[PDB]
Write an enzyme that holds these catalytic residues in place. Structure first.
Site: not given
Ligand SMILES: Nc1ccn([C@@H]2O[C@H](COP(=O)(O)OP(=O)(O)O)[C@@H](O)[C@H]2O)c(=O)n1
Ligand SMILES: Nc1ncnc2c1ncn2[C@H]1C[C@H](O)[C@@H](COP(=O)(O)OP(=O)(O)OP(=O)(O)O)O1
Ligand SMILES: Nc1ncnc2c1ncn2[C@H]1C[C@H](O)[C@@H](COP(=O)(O)OP(=O)(O)OP(=O)(O)O)O1
Ligand SMILES: Nc1ncnc2c1ncn2[C@H]1C[C@H](O)[C@@H](COP(=O)(O)OP(=O)(O)OP(=O)(O)O)O1
Ligand SMILES: Nc1ncnc2c1ncn2[C@H]1C[C@H](O)[C@@H](COP(=O)(O)OP(=O)(O)OP(=O)(O)O)O1
Ligand SMILES: Nc1ccn([C@@H]2O[C@H](COP(=O)(O)OP(=O)(O)O)[C@@H](O)[C@H]2O)c(=O)n1
Ligand SMILES: [Mg+2]
Ligand SMILES: [Mg+2]
Ligand SMILES: [Mg+2]
Ligand SMILES: [Mg+2]
Lengths: 745, 745
Positions: B429, B431, B433
């Protein structure tokens, strides 16, 4: 800890903001609540607050903020006056007597000396009479001053104790009435109520030293040189030092000092002239200040134009040049005879001589001066010959550059004065309104009293004449009681002021009397009006001095004066007065009883006094309809409140009319929102032709037994209006050609 | 008229200032009154007030001013939280049910459409069960957020009505628990209380669309190309458009597109390669935003390094150059096999080929990739031969300049995953993981759930293990209930996510668990500690999925996985776990019942989630002890409050210690006021050697069945620490070489 303020008791509290609006709305009763807004004032005060602030700073800044917000609605002036005056009346004591005991029981806080603020006889009069006199005072009148007049009254005039002001204003005015009317109390209560109702006010040294330990109530001092030697020069310097110590104004006749290059029989050398001598008087004018540094000591230097050092004398108060050839903290003036007028008139020549070569000249005026000056002009004893229009061009260069020299007319003053029997009037005071005899033995002293005018205008817009003579009678009794209480700083002053005994009366705020009488300044009823006014003032003055001479006998040198010969001041102008009064019975009672004071009327400038009472400076029109105000962090524009009083009623006032008068500098006549009557009632003095004012000065000064100040306002330097203006003033017969040439930038 | 404020009812009043300090001191109960000062806050609020202001701006600016004053004493954070949270709780409704009826009964205010914020089945569950559920909510927990976490939670996550926020935070969290636990209520109250007590939190699309009209609760999307044709490229572009509409994160395997110059059999031309294609994906990443513009739609592009366009791929996310040869709003990543590691290792050569010439390559990993790559390397079918250290120098130029590309290890991920039986894992993906199988038919979808850590630390400073597995069981039941409720935006998503059924669990705030357990970051008990923690999380996850598979049967493709062969994730790392747990009975019950979810553990970065709950970003240390805060008109410095919590107790804190740490950028170890224990408990990550963190990642990622984010912090560009760092990560066995190369300026 937290934000604590130091509450006036000396304690501290938390900052609770509704105490402010709790107090202001308590002090807003009787105003237009549609624009009176405590929240803006509170907001700008809280912009300045911090931790550990004494609350009197919060009231001071509150009145200051209201003073800056006065532009939005004129009731914030009444508000700011109530804030500052309530701040003072919460502070000091209610009873006058315990204030006087605090002032007399003063002790120097690091020398232990019982150094009083008032004399013990003043405290004796108070403590013997405190029961009626504490009942006579009315504290309802202190909320009647303007704000800026109250701050000017507070910063310098109220007697302070260790930096904290400990006098209410009615304590000062009642202190003055005790300080003059010593034994009598009815005169102190009529004088107090007529005084504190703002009818007339005394001069500023009277407000300084009434009833204090060194009572020097006088404000006019005319000194001439004792001798043309070092002993005469430095003894005259000593007398000017003592008189400038005891808060007087000093005008010096420096005609009789020998010029540059004349032989000195003592040490076989040659004199350097007048320039280093007047430089010594420059540093003396810087060193000694009048009173307790309350205003700087200023000297007038009068010179007749035939003296040889006249060119370096005229180039002496300037800005550029070498520093050792300038004496710029003085005030210079020319005492011009008719011959320099005639020689400038017909482009002839002029004889600059030295008074060691040609002795005994300044004591001779008129045709006799023409004969003696022609006889020395014949013998070739003169030293320089200069074309007269060149020196006239130098005079216009000096007046154009700085406004100095002043110009007075020698033969006009010597011809039209009541002290002709003594000799020749050499000089005059600093503000050029006291024309009296000086000598080696008699140093001329004159007292002053300024009557306001606009308090006399009734609601009918018809002026009150019968009150004005009555208050003038009370004033003449006040000054004639002043002359016998005063402590003269030099021994030559007492002999002059008790032999000849002159007084001085001058009015302030003529423009307000014209506006409240609703006439144009250059109308017919204005020129009729001031003529009638000074016939009333002059008539009541002569009736008052007549009724004094009926009770104490005339002064020591009366028989010989032209008043004893029946000629009053108006016949010396050859102008028969109007039919407004009865002069025949006056001249009968004068012919059967004489008068008590030699010279009576004297229009002074009254900068500070009119600054207190809000009136305009004495007789001139308004400088502009917009006048600025000196406020800490705000130096801004406030329109004339009579003009604004008419504009809020006539509807043409709106929320940007101030901005419409910004770009015209007081000229309301350029705006299209005009009823075309305010253009006549509110003429800017720059928009006023000066020769009409000079004609008005010929009439009014034709009813004045001394000279009068004359601030000349001309917008641009032009030699025709200057030269024709001075010649026109000489043709009308005026005793004072100019007092300042003011040019707005 | 006057200064009137618009009071929240809609009316207006005069400005009365003691209402402010009347309210703040009401909201200051329970704080240190030695430094809590309402007057400063009131003063700076009144600096901003004017006439005609809505009072909610005064509470907003009050909480803002308290947030800026938090530097003076740490209780102003608690104050500012109480101001903002009290401002919201005075505003909206008390009852959850009428809020839900307001959201479902929403009408578009210029189109009349009954356009709900929640689905009708959600409102059915609420209205059938509002009596127990309105009793279950506890509003005492909303005053427990930080201020900046509350403003971040408010600006984007609470469901707004016409610009006005109409949800309390407990309304959102209870809305989530209804949105997941549909029929059951006991799970909604255990899930609500375990949720709102801040133990774990779901991912951000779950907070977006729980129970709403388009429930798309997923946050991980892995897509590969359908075809190397125009139909495959633009159909994949369509799927990325829909998935980026419904607020997902998209990582794309772009390995199988032919390179520049290859022949095109349809139109007899030659391809232009990947650069304009990825430029089309650049504008698609700009156009479609995730959700209602809540965060911009971002794409990951994964490329294996043997592709011919690799140099223009690496020079593609830069700042300079021509604009038509840059695609900088994407995120680039290299999917590196072991052969590029070995050829960079021994300075050998490297064969850049084209996947039209050499077909079927990216589906082959490990030794088989070595054999197939050597066989194409033998035949001369390759197109370019580049020395491997030159391309490695280009990679370090790109990571040095921007931080992109990411680096993942192909054979390491394909070898150590539970989805070996399906084929070859192509990509991951955004990020980095989620390492799952993608295909033409199966588009990989994974759900997330972030557990916090520092809520588990007891007062004894001994960590609680038995609670963590229990909450992990509740989390696994939550996500496994999420997978069956979700509405997948594309039809290929449902088949993958219901055949293989993966979940994702990631923790946040490891530095706070180390500080509250009082250990140095590079100590022995830290490396023992995180190992024990992820043995607990991994053990409880496997027990939870075992107990689910005991009740519903394992997933559709279980028999064939290495878990069915008994090999868990730790044996693929060949690391026997500690004696902290009992793994034998776990492997017996798995051997008798299987597991319900294929892949379990996934440390995500959690930028926004840790921004809410105040924890640090997932596993890294603090960037600096001083961290800045974005405040309108104030962007300032706040120290780490655990460090400050120790400094106020140890006495070394004073009124300028902040200024002492300004000039060192978080480095507390340079100051002379040091107990020499804070230098170990509060190591700046710039002052931490990276290889110890890499060893900790080898242990912790040795207990994780997927990859993990790894923010690499290196202060200066140096090729030795970079090159030895990536080779060291490959030698430890890590699935992710880097996620960012961060250089502080
Ligand atoms: N700028 C971002 C960062 C994360 N993500 C998504 O959120 C997932 C986990 O990032 P995260 O937990 O930091 O996102 P948040 O829950 O903090 O918004 C990643 O696998 C991405 O799919 C996103 O769509 N856009
Ligand atoms: N607690 C306060 N905090 C801040 N300002 C105050 C406070 N109390 C009064 N002020 C302001 C209001 C006025 O603008 C100014 C003077 O207040 P003031 O009441 O006259 O002093 P004071 O309390 O000793 O007089 P008094 O005792 O007669 O009421 O200071
Ligand atoms: N040493 C000097 N330096 C500059 N000016 C002097 C000096 N001595 C005298 N004067 C000026 C001061 C007077 O204006 C003027 C005459 O002073 P004064 O004492 O009368 O002279 P004198 O009596 O010694 O000689 P004479 O009989 O000519 O006056 O000369
Ligand atoms: N009359 C006022 N003038 C200026 N500020 C005010 C005024 N009244 C209140 N404030 C300030 C105090 C708070 O910081 C903020 C919001 O006040 P607040 O009392 O909660 O609104 P409100 O009066 O509608 O709520 P409530 O009716 O429940 O008391 O505005
Ligand atoms: N007109 C074009 N411009 C740029 N690129 C193109 C164009 N047509 C095709 N491509 C690229 C897109 C794909 O990456 C690649 C193959 O597309 P595709 O539709 O499969 O060609 P094709 O089927 O007609 O011939 P082939 O059988 O060789 O693939 O070529
Ligand atoms: N700067 C000044 C102005 C005037 N005066 C004296 O005060 C007299 C009248 O001037 P004035 O009435 O304007 O002085 P105030 O009473 O306003 O202070 C003059 O004759 C001078 O003697 C002074 O001493 N210093
Ligand atoms: Mg008070
Ligand atoms: Mg001599
Ligand atoms: Mg309220
Ligand atoms: Mg094709």
């Amino acid at each position: 800890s937290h934000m604590h303020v130091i509450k006036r008791d000396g304690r501290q509290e938390r900052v609770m903001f509704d105490k402010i609006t709790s107090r202001i709305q308590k002090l807003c009763y009787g105003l237009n609540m549609d624009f009176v807004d405590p929240a803006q004032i509170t907001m700008k005060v809280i912009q300045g607050l911090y931790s550990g602030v004494t609350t009197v700073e919060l009231d001071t800044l509150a009145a200051e903020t209201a003073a800056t917000l006065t532009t939005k609605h004129p009731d914030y002036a009444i508000l700011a006056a109530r804030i500052a005056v309530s701040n003072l009346h919460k502070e000091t004591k209610k009873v006058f007597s315990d204030v006087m005991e605090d002032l007399y029981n003063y002790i120097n806080p690091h020398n232990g000396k019982h150094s009083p603020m008032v004399a013990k006889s003043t405290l004796d009069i108070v403590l013997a009479n405190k029961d009626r006199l504490n009942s006579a005072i009315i504290y309802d009148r202190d909320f009647s001053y303007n704000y800026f007049g109250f701050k000017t009254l507070e910063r310098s005039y109220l007697l302070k104790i260790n930096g904290k002001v400990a006098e209410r204003p009615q304590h000062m005015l009642m202190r003055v009435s005790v300080g003059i009317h010593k034994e009598d109390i009815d005169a102190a209560i009529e004088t107090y109520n007529l005084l504190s109702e703002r009818w007339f006010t005394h001069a500023s040294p009277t407000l300084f030293n009434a009833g204090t330990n060194r009572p020097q109530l006088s404000s006019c001092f005319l000194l001439s040189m004792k001798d043309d030697s070092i002993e005469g020069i430095y003894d005259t310097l000593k007398q000017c030092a003592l008189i400038s110590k005891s808060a007087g104004g000093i005008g010096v006749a420096v005609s009789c000092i020998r010029a540059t290059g004349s032989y000195i029989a003592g040490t076989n050398g040659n004199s350097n002239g007048l320039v280093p001598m007047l430089r010594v008087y420059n540093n003396t004018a810087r060193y000694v200040d009048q009173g307790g540094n309350k205003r700087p000591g200023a000297f007038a230097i009068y010179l007749e134009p035939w003296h040889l050092d006249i060119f370096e004398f005229l180039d002496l108060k300037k800005n550029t040049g070498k520093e050792e050839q300038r004496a710029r903290d003085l005030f210079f003036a020319l005492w011009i005879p008719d011959l320099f007028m005639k020689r400038v008139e017909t482009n002839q020549d002029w004889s600059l001589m030295c008074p060691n070569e040609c002795p005994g000249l300044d004591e001779v005026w008129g045709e006799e001066f023409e004969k003696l000056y022609a006889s020395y002009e014949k013998q070739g004893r003169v030293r320089k010959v200069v074309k007269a229009q060149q020196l006239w061009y130098a005079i216009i260069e000096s007046q154009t550059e700085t406004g100095t020299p002043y110009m007075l007319y020698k033969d006009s003053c010597n011809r039209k004065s009541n002290q002709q029997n003594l000799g020749t009037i050499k000089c005059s005071n600093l503000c050029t309104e006291i024309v009296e005899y000086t000598s080696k033995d008699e140093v001329a002293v004159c007292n002053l009293a300024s009557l306001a005018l606009n308090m006399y205008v009734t609601s009918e817009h018809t002026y009150d004449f019968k009150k004005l003579a009555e208050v003038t009678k009370v004033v003449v009794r006040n000054l004639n009681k002043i002359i016998d209480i005063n402590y003269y700083p030099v021994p030559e002053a007492c002999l002059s002021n008790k032999r000849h005994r002159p007084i001085g009366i001058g009015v302030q705020g003529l423009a307000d009397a014209f506006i409240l009488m609703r006439y144009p300044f250059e109308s017919a009823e204005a020129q009729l009006l001031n003529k009638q006014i000074f016939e009333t003032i002059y008539y009541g003055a002569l009736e008052a001095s007549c009724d004094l001479a009926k009770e104490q006998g005339p002064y020591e040198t009366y028989e010989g004066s032209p008043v004893s010969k029946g000629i009053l001041q108006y016949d010396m102008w050859n102008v028969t007065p109007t039919d407004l009064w009865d002069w025949k019975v006056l001249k009968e009672k004068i012919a059967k009883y004489g008068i008590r004071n030699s010279l009576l009327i004297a229009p002074m400038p009254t900068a500070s006094t009119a600054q207190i009472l809000g009136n305009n400076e004495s007789i001139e029109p308004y400088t502009s309809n917009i006048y600025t105000r000196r406020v800490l962090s705000g130096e801004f524009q406030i329109v004339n409140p009579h003009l604004l009083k008419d504009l809020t009623e006539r509807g043409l006032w709106h929320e940007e009319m101030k901005n419409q008068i910004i770009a015209c500098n007081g000229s309301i006549q350029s705006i299209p929102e005009i009823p075309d009557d305010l253009k006549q009632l509110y003429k800017t003095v720059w928009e006023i032709s000066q020769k009409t004012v000079l004609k008005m000065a010929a009439e009014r000064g034709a009813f004045i037994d001394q000279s009068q100040s004359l601030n000349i306002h001309i917008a641009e330097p032009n030699y025709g209006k200057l030269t024709s203006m001075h010649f026109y003033g000489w043709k009308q017969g005026l005793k004072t050609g100019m007092y300042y040439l003011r040019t707005r930038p």
